[PDB]
Amino acid sequence: NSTTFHQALLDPRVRGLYFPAGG
Structure with missing residues:
Protein backbone atom coordinates (compact mmCIF):
# COMPACT_ATOMS: atom_id res chain seq x y z
CA ASN A 1 0.00 0.00 0.00
CA SER A 2 1.53 3.37 -1.10
CA THR A 3 -0.69 4.77 1.71
CA THR A 4 1.30 2.89 4.38
CA PHE A 5 4.26 4.68 2.78
CA HIS A 6 2.97 8.22 2.61
CA GLN A 7 1.61 8.00 6.18
CA ALA A 8 5.20 8.77 7.17
CA LEU A 9 6.10 11.64 4.95
CA LEU A 10 7.88 12.95 8.03
CA ASP A 11 5.70 10.98 10.57
CA PRO A 12 2.59 8.54 10.27
CA ARG A 13 0.08 11.16 9.38
Whole structure:
Protein backbone atom coordinates (compact mmCIF):
# COMPACT_ATOMS: atom_id res chain seq x y z
CA ASN A 1 0.00 0.00 0.00
CA SER A 2 1.53 3.37 -1.10
CA THR A 3 -0.69 4.77 1.71
CA THR A 4 1.30 2.89 4.38
CA PHE A 5 4.26 4.68 2.78
CA HIS A 6 2.97 8.22 2.61
CA GLN A 7 1.61 8.00 6.18
CA ALA A 8 5.20 8.77 7.17
CA LEU A 9 6.10 11.64 4.95
CA LEU A 10 7.88 12.95 8.03
CA ASP A 11 5.70 10.98 10.57
CA PRO A 12 2.59 8.54 10.27
CA ARG A 13 0.08 11.16 9.38
CA VAL A 14 2.14 13.98 7.95
CA ARG A 15 0.47 12.53 4.80
CA GLY A 16 -2.74 14.66 5.24
CA LEU A 17 -0.69 17.91 5.40
CA TYR A 18 0.97 17.08 2.15
CA PHE A 19 -1.04 16.26 -0.93
CA PRO A 20 -1.72 19.66 -2.55
CA ALA A 21 -4.47 19.05 -5.17
CA GLY A 22 -2.58 20.94 -7.88
CA GLY A 23 0.74 19.34 -8.88
